[PDB]
Structure 1
């Protein structure tokens, strides 16, 4: 997940926490390094 995060969006992830949901899907919480703004990345993604 870290490698894919870096490849898809040119950002660096310092932590990934994962859980599998009661409906069967897997969800990840990805924290970016302080050199990157998650708000800027979210705007680029289109959130």
Structure 2
């Protein structure tokens, strides 16, 4: 192989999920829709966002909706399964 750089497999999910959003719209979706809002890698995937959510937060996502914002960033609307509570994981994440 012509590529010899060491790449860690346990840190890929940290690039996929960057940070949550705490806007007024984002907080509304947590309560009535069990949905978390995140800024994700702009080249990331809906399938890969689901896997990253499992690794980083040990929650199961039933649906991921993505959009590329007008400022160039990619935002993900992640609905967690009814087994998990979005408010509870939001407290664990630290956004409350």
Report deviation, 1:20: 0.2
The secondary structure found in structure 1 opposite 2:59 is coil
Residues paired across the two proteins, number? 47
C-alpha distance in structure 1 between counterparts of 2:82 and 2:54, whole Å: 15
Q: Which runs of 5+ in 1 are unaligned?
A: none
The secondary structure found in structure 2 opposite 1:34 is coil
Report deviation, 1:38: 0.3
Q: Deviations over 1:6-37 (max 9, x none)?
A: 00000000000000000000000000000000
The secondary structure found in structure 2 opposite 1:40 is helix
Root mean square deviation of aligned Cα: 0.3
TM-score, normalised by the number of residues in structure 1: 0.98
Q: Which runs of 5+ in 2 are unaligned?
A: 1-48
**Which protein shows a greater Rg?**
2
TM-score, normalised by the number of residues in structure 2: 0.49
Please list every run of at least 4 consecutive aligned residues from structure 1 whose deviation after the TM superposition is greater than 2 angstroms: none
